[PDB]
């Protein structure tokens, strides 16, 4: 009688069954009875809380357990007749059941797992008794007690199912908990171990996503150990531990030590997966040996059992299931660790950036820090996926090669030489891949920069009508983009072909061709099929070895950047004391101590410092610091803000701070959100402020309500709008201490006169409280209650204007309530507002599943190319299957003829077959990429650019610039690469699945009945996952960008936010943002895990069906060992193929939806500007004119006539249709009721291009394009360089071209024109206008962006240069109003 784990029959013997049951019962009864009972009694004190319904299901489970224990006690008597170790198993099961009878009662996990092990043990014992009954008498072969052991088995199954499945209902008011119905709690908090591995909760979420499109409400709240606060504190404790033993690697040690446990668990699970994976080749080998030995046995019987095969099939199924469960648990743990890393690091970087020093901001550009927050944290999050894999790879390689050495033999390591010699080729190809990716990213960023540059001021581009050089340059860049993308496609296709071909075919065709005969031993079909499976498993380590090393190298750069960023210089707490509020009026509000001294230097003691200056401001006054550029005005103001390191002096600031910098700051949120800057609403005070500072016309001009979108991700706003918004925000922030740095600079001067009296002067709203307004305006100096002349960081004199006037006035003159404070907001919760705006566009369709869009893309490609691609894919798959089946035939021949190989002949045949399949895949991936794909990028981009270039001003003013900027740039890139990859992957995996199922059907006829239900299940899960993951990916893409945009904006307004002391609100907003992003990502990865689990379970069921049907065919009749080996070997490739193909399906769907969106952007039309059938010595006239958008009205009842050679000055009060006259004259809007006549010709009949080409505009703006000055002034090569030189000389800008442009007339320009002053840009626009030879000229806004000399120069230039050209000037200057021959008055509406 045997006693090992395997008997002569394949089943466990009785001894090993008792041993494993004893082990399971021992570990259960010790670990549950210690840990769970002690913890429950300690926490709950034997269950203080009696909350339980005591439903009948629990009593039924208890009674089932009791009757099972009774049956066990009854069967204990009979089995003890033999003298064996079964009494130990009986006693252990008795004690375990007796403990469980109380354990079930006490809880109202470990219990469930123990019941599963007990059920498996009873099932194994029953199978043993049935097998002995097959080998012996009918029923009572072993003993008569198996009939009640069946009752024990069914009782175990029933109690396991009835404990695992149903919930624990509670009677007394369970509904009271769910008060907050904004989001359901996640089911993950309430999920036992049986359901958690199966992810049934995600199946419920999948159903809810199937029946409804997901929104904020449908998603669940995150569970604990995911919010910002706990993760940030847990990282800060490890950061203090770094501060104990500070050094550069301390950041890495703190990060790893705070989350290393989950990575260790992931490592253990990966080890379990790796050791389990190679068992299946061994089971394949022993199955092949068993079937061929059984055929030999039957032949010997004819010359002179099935239980092994069935149990081997069951072993294969169990191996597949355990592999599935442990692998997906590993993936879940690793991605959870990455989520923790991202959530901690983003919050910590935000806090450190918020408390960062101003000098540190000066030493660190905004691009570097925002790129650090975007890429480096994402780099760590991505590297968390592959971090354990660097350890997993060598172990898998070592155990695979050990198994190969045991199987094949000694000194047969040609595969090792192929691996090690091919690895440097992989390294070189990965290097070229990285270089191509970096160059492509640089080119994409450059093209996006050019597009943003033109789109910032494309209104002026439309007016000048220089579109042809723009699109020509874009196509010129597109040529380089096309060739670089072609090179990337060629390299990627070569990499794909080498990865497909190099490992399996070449390594096999070397090793089993050579070393089988070189060792003098027949193949006999046991070697090559396990060898082929081993090579297929070993393919992944070859690519995995160099891949993770690149990101591992990048991790050093990322962690070094993070470490220097963290340990960069902070600022001291003691720069200034923000004391309590101001007392009753008279004492002090602000004080800088005696001989105070400050600087922008603490460590090295740079020269940037001021020394020995004091300051004092009385309560309720207006002060003004007056000084030139570099005077130390900004230094003194920032010192008052406390943003400096003091070296000497006493700084006390009373009350609260309100501050406006010279550069206005605007948040991404709406104008309502900006003006209501985290404060409770107050309607009358809001109306008072908006009346006093701004105007209601300033709200009306926005073409939207108060909830309009700010120009950062909305409609662009002019500088005066920004200044008025900043002043409105400041005055709405009712505060004690007030600070303004030239807010009137970026607005009209006569409107600045309205500003000073209404809000600042003694009638002003904030009259009785201290305010500093630093400006060099004479009206401000006259009205101000104190003046401080400052220069070079040292005050010269201070006092009242009375004190100034007494001595020589040279050095400045010749050169009972306190408004009840403000009131902050309550720090509320905030959703992601971007969802509804795109939901408006998505509302058109809800069943977008028809493939008309796919056939449209097919028409947009060459369909013959698609047919050739399909045929090439099928040819490659057929060649591979032919190679495998011919290998089966050759191995069967070698099995029949004992050691009589046609070795060279079949070596040549197999080499030809494999290299033919590899070349077919090569020609598929290389050439047809070039034909269909870049044709698509070229054509889709040409149509999109052609449509969007000719778009109307209604589209430009309505749609945001940023919205079409991101979609035009990003989505064109996604269709270029990702779509072309994913279509190929989808078709390859589809054809692979079809051929695998076809050969399996060829193995046995009756497989269609088993494959049909599994195919239905597969289609069901694919539909559910697609309709969920589409919306989840959309939400994830939505929530990513607002975090980085908010980081950029709060960095830009660092001074203003730190002055306003709203640091808590911004921190809470960042925490809410990352919480929303985590909520919009965790269901996505868990949905991926759920789908991959169920698909791999389907693959394991396919393995079981193939094996058991093969054994059934074996029992039914003759069966070849090679056919079974081939069928099982092809069956083993199912799981990875299905798990990839569904994901590629949803990716193709997402890419096609993006293609439809950008095509919808391309779905636009406008008027035809082309020539279809004109200056000087001609009259001009307008009659009955009307031209505005349909939703508004400005122009009506206008009849005017202008003779040639007359100058016109237009005058109008604010809002009286000023710019509409210019746009009507240019005929920018196609709507034209009436007739405008020039040269006795109606303007609308001809077109737009020639008319715009034959006029001159000064658009009130001076920002121009980047690039060469000659290209900017004269993009089309009109006439020479001497002409523009003369125009520049007449415009009097010789100084700039003399200073710069040393190489020639080719000086470069920074984009946006900020490198040079606005007056010089105005001179450049003047020079361009004078270069334009047209008589019609439009001039606008001469009285709001000039410094007197510019106005005189342009007035004399338009006077003397255009002696007779018709000039219409729209301005407020008295001189140009008087000098005009005919003053046209701009009526309010007609």
Residue numbers in the entry: 17 to 124, 133 to 328, 341 to 851, 901 to 1258, 1268 to 1484
Publication passage describing the model:
Yeast Cadmium Factor 1 (Ycf1) sequesters heavy metals and glutathione into the vacuole to counter cell stress. Ycf1 belongs to the ATP binding cassette C-subfamily (ABCC) of transporters, many of which are regulated by phosphorylation on intrinsically-disordered domains. In asymmetric ABC transporters, like Ycf1, only one of two NBDs (NBD2) is capable of efficient ATP hydrolysis.
In this study, we have used cryo-EM to determine the 3.4 and 4.0 Å resolution structures of endogenously phosphorylated Saccharomyces cerevisiae Ycf1 in two inward-facing conformations: wide (IFwide) and narrow (IFnarrow). We designated the state in which the NBDs are further apart as IFwide and the state in which the NBDs are closer as IFnarrow. The R-domain encircles NBD1 in both IFwide and IFnarrow and is stabilized by extensive contacts along a basic groove of the NBD1 perimeter, intracellular loop 4, and the Lasso motif. Instead, a rearrangement within the R-domain correlates with overall movements in the structure, including a change in angle between residues G913, G918, and G932 of the R-domain from 130° (IFwide) to ~137° (IFnarrow). In contrast to the interaction sites themselves, the major structural consequences of the IFwide to IFnarrow transition are induced at the ATP-binding sites. These sites not only move closer in IFnarrow but also rotate to occlude the non-functional ATP-binding site in NBD1. Notably, the second site in NBD2 (active) is open for ATP binding. Overall, these architectural changes resemble changes in substrate-bound and substrate-free states of the Ycf1 homolog MRP1. These movements support a model where R-domain phosphorylation helps stabilize NBD1 to recruit other domains into a conformation (IFnarrow) suitable for ATP binding and initiation of transport.
